[PDB]
């Protein structure tokens, strides 16, 4: 078959991200070629159909098969596929997009957008900017960046260091200096007997303790996803963001909001920052910026950092930072069409409405399930965490592969939901066009899967 | 399709768009006016006011098939309609990325290459390289063997670790770079070589400097050496005769991996398939971007040799799935753009054009500028070339940087409708035209440059 020939070429020549390299190459872990899709459904090269309740990777937010977006990419590609944006050069779509991000989407007090292609390159830029900012101000020691356990901020050297999951550290010598990781903001794993408000205060106090141990004048920034994505779909505890921000303000520490997942509608607000009342100095975007139709990332720079960057150019000349593809015309054109759709179909409001329905349905269906320790989520992201003992929150032996098994049972029933890393967790992040009826279908399939695995154990 | 309201767009630009590599205050205030590029065809681009320019820099060494390829726009469009995106994590794939991987390995990359890993930028690809080099040494039980040796004036990206690799001060100053464990050895620029050394002697001097560095560091602590076959952003600097052979012998003696950064030289520019082919390099790892898609869509590649690949597979045995991935790794539309780009390069034999019209280019530049009083050196290979300007040709004396001699020659070219780059940290005029360029277009470029160089020479 054509699939067999392609799979063969794949195994012989393609190094996949996040794959068992030996077992892929040998054919021990079979591959899958995705060829098409529409709305929330995708299709493989053998014609099999799947409900994609993970929207690729939290990213195909307007759904699959938007010919509107393909048309917009095509028109830009015909007119001017590329020019650089170095030394004040520009193109029409990147200018239009920058104005739209600032005026209509980003929180108030944001000033400028800098572009790359990945969440990783955007967070790399953030770190560079934070160091530069402190050097411009004559604070050479104020450089440490505090991230969080289970946070996800990319897969590079410095960005993998920010990331708080061991797969991105082990055997890569990370994290490097000067990165630190504070408390995982996951109430389910809070110290025993803590209320939610107590746990938010515990997180704040642990951060303070870290800042004092480091010396506050050496701590430049704090980076956090409003809701943790890859670390297990973890909304923050009640009062967390207010308690954290008071500590950061007390010690003059910049806040970076990593909105790569929460950006552009997924929580039911425009950004996760809007949803939780965060006031970041710097914002990272990607994924839902284009619904993955073309690669694009953004660093949204607040007025306070921007003023210092302008001061920096006065004293030091043009900023020594650029990517060849910064502000790429076709990627910008894809973003514009994507945002047109999000606005026109009010997918932010759908994420709030169908999302609340999703969360309610998940709680009803799984809140008393013997296998499920916690049901959590906000808007159109949700997860089920599985435990061996609900009373003591005891984890399964990782060799039992409980999460991966529930995910595999879902896939047998034609639905894609992710076995989240470093845990037994089933995550959902469907396209923002999903209907309530489609939510029912997803929940029903998950219910059958969770039951099947529970019976086996 | 539609005219552009230039004044209004320029205004929105200044108020909201943070450009790469721009004077941020002067851009925002309007003191450095912007330029909006709206169109292009072949080697010419057009701004929003309708002005036309010959782009002798191919954007940034990247628009290699030339501008306005509707064939590539069609291929992007067909993939975007069929499947704009899915991830390639856990063995998932798409048809164009599989096809591209096979074509890169079987038809383009040097012998002994095994696999391709994908990103979107030269910078993210070199970031992947460093991760892979450290992982490789950890798999082998050599935790100390981690240092990466780069070179003065080398260019490898604009990130934290990649900017550290980069050997130009603009990417270091006020960013606290370079970090450990990066080192920089000798700039392979013969024009600035110790006086009275032949080219081959200077190659041996560079080899000996590298060896000295390795011994001072302790060879068991040195993991890899990274180099562009020909330096791009560091001033269009072909290596001296014998350089790559002499370097490789040192790297082999001390079990040090070679990374070839082919972001510029990859896919035809030197008149060979890769710079590695052209100079007889045998890299363990290869970085590509730019000419991989002719910039029609963002894509980068890390080409992994058989020796590193074997250890990566061994690593998976020991440690499980590799903890590395970008969301857009193997992006379908970017892969489709690459395939159409490579079809054009192969069909029109742009590698051969780069050799033929390139040799003509180099010869024409020598004839025109080899005795010019302002020009210390004419250099290049294939379709990259530079003029380096000096205040005294006998002693190779540099101009006071405040005279801005390089920027002024570039600005005079632009007045005459041609884009050629004032290269950073020196007085150097660089050329890297699209690979479709004709001899006739080379004559036009050379003539414009001649007038520009004469004009600035008169002013001094
Ligand atoms: C996916 C993700 C990233 C990394 O983006 P890439 O485009 O994969 O580099 C960064 N931060 C968060 C919060 C993400 O979810
Ligand atoms: C341009 C360049 C890079 C970085 O590529 P980006 O796509 O700009 O990140 C790396 N290496 C070399 C030799 C380059 O010319």
d(CA A121, CA A284): 10
Alpha carbons A454 and A30: distance in angstroms, whole number: 26
Resolution to one decimal, Å: 2.0
Give the best residue of A117, A333, A418 to mutate against chain B (max B CB count within 10 A): A117
Please name the helix (run of DSSP H) or strand (run of DSSP E) that holds residue A411, with its range, or none: helix A402-412
Tokens of B419: 């884009």
Task: Report the atom number in ligand 2 closest to the C-alpha of B233.
Answer: 15
Question: Which DSSP symbol is given to B22?
Answer: S
Cβ atoms of A324 and A152 within 8 Å: the answer is no
Distances from the Cα of B295 to the Cαs of A44, B306, B334, B409, in angstroms?
29, 28, 10, 27
Q: Is A119 in the pocket of ligand 1 (CB under 6 A)?
A: yes
Q: In chain B, what is the greatest distance between 2 CA atoms, to the nearest angstrom?
A: 68
DSSP, collapsed to helix, strand or coil, labels residue A196 as helix
Helix H or strand E segment including A402: helix A402-412
Q: B393 to chain A, minimum CA–CA distance in Å?
A: 30
Write down the CATH number for the domain with range A1-65+345-457: 3.90.1150.10
DSSP per-residue codes, B126-184:
HHHHHHHHHHHHHHTT-TT--EEEEETT----SSHHHHHHS--GGGTTTTT-SPTTEEE
Q: Judge whether A163 and A153 are in contact, CB under 8 Å.
A: yes
Using a 6 Å CB cutoff, which residues line ligand 2? A 323-325; B 121-123, 126, 155-157, 228, 232-233, 261, 263-264, 289
For Cα atoms B57, B58, B61, give the angle at the middle one, nearest 5 degrees: 80
- How distant is the Cα of B149 from the closest Cα of chain A, in angstroms? 17
A180-190 burial, b at 16+ Cβ within 10 Å, e below that, comes to bbbbbbbbebb
CATH 3.40.640.10 range(s) for chain A read 66-344
CB-nearest to B37 from A20, A91, A299 is A91
Every domain range in chain A assigned CATH 3.90.1150.10:
1-65+345-457
A286 lines ligand 1 (CB under 6 A): yes
In a mutational test of the pocket of ligand 2, which residue from B20, B155, B334 has the highest number of ligand atoms less than 8 Å from its CB? B155
Q: Do A17 and B159 touch (CB under 8 A)?
A: no
Atom of ligand 1 nearest to the CA of A229: 15
Report how far ligand 1's centroid is from the alpha carbon of B138 (Å): 26
Closest by Cβ to A90, choosing from B34, B95, B322? B34
Domain B1-68+348-460 falls under CATH 3.90.1150.10: yes
3 state DSSP class of A297: strand
Q: Distance from the CA of A149 to the center of ligand 1, in angstroms?
A: 16
The ligand whose atoms approach the alpha carbon of A227 most closely is: 1
Q: Which residue in B19, B145, B434 has the most chain A C-beta atoms within 10 A of its own C-beta, making it the best mutation to test that interface?
A: B19
Task: Judge whether B304 and B116 are in contact, CB under 8 Å.
Answer: yes
Contact yes or no for B117 and A15 at CB 8 A: yes
Q: Which of B316, B268, B315, B300 is nearest to B129 (CA)?
A: B300
Which residue in the set A59, A67, A99 is minimally distant from B16, CB to CB?
A: A99
Report the nearest atom of ligand 2 relative to the CA of B159.
Answer: 9
Experimental method: X-ray
Fold of B69-347: 3.40.640
Residue A120 contacts residue B124 (beta carbons within 8 Å): yes
Which residue ranges does chain B devote to CATH 3.40.640.10? 69-347
Give the H or E element holding residue B292.
Answer: none
A15, A300, A303, A308: which to substitute to probe chain B, counting the most B Cβ within 10 Å?
A15
Domain A66-344, architecture per CATH = 3-Layer(aba) Sandwich (3.40)
């Amino acid at each position: 078959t054509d699939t067999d020939d392609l799979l063969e070429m794949d195994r012989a020549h393609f190094f996949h991200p996040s794959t068992h390299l030996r077992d892929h190459a040998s054919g021990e872990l079979p591959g899958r070629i995705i060829t098409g899709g529409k709305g929330i459904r995708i299709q493989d090269s053998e014609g099999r159909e799947y409900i994609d309740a993970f929207a690729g990777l939290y990213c195909v937010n307007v759904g699959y098969g938007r010919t509107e977006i393909a048309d917009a990419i095509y028109e830009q590609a015909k007119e001017l596929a590329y020019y650089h944006t170095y030394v004040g050069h520009s193109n029409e779509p990147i200018i239009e997009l920058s104005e739209r991000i600032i005026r209509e989407w980003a929180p108030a007090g944001m000033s400028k957008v800098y572009y790359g292609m990945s969440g990783s390159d955007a967070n790399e830029t953030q770190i560079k900017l934070v160091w530069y900012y402190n050097n411009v101000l004559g604070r050479p020691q104020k450089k440490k960046i505090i991230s969080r356990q289970r946070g996800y901020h990319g897969s590079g050297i410095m960005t993998g260091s920010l990331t708080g999951l061991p797969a991105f550290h082990n055997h890569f010598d990370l994290p490097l200096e000067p990165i630190r990781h504070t408390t995982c903001p996951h109430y389910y794993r809070a110290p025993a007997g803590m209320s939610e408000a107590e746990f938010s205060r515990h997180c704040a106090d642990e951060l303070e303790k870290m800042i004092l141990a480091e010396g506050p004048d050496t701590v430049a920034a704090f980076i956090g996803e409003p809701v943790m994505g890859t670390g297990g779909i973890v909304p923050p505890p009640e009062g967390y963001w207010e308690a954290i921000q008071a500590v950061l303000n007390k010690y003059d520490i910049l806040l970076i909001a990593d909105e790569v997942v929460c950006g552009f509608g997924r929580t039911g607000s425009m950004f996760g920052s809007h949803h939780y009342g965060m006031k970041p100095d710097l914002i990272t975007v990607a994924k839902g910026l284009t619904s993955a139709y073309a690669p694009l990332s953004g660093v949204i720079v607040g007025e306070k950092v921007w003023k210092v960057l302008e001061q920096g150019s006065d004293q030091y000349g043009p900023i020594g930072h650029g990517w060849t593809y910064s502000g790429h015309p076709i990627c910008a054109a894809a973003a514009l069409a994507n945002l047109d759709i999000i606005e026109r179909e009010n997918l932010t409001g759908n994420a709030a409405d169908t999302g609340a329905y999703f969360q309610q349905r998940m709680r009803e269906t799984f809140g008393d399930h013997p296998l499920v320790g916690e049901v959590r989520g906000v808007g159109l992201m949700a997860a089920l965490e599985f435990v061996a003992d609900k009373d003591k929150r005891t984890r399964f032996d990782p060799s039992l592969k409980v999460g991966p098994r529930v995910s595999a049972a879902c896939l047998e029933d034609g639905m894609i939901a992710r076995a989240m890393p470093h845990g037994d967790i089933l995550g959902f992040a469907p396209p923002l066009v999903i209907t309530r009826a489609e939510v029912d279908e997803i929940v029903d399939i998950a219910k059958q899967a969770v039951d099947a695995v529970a019976d086996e154990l």
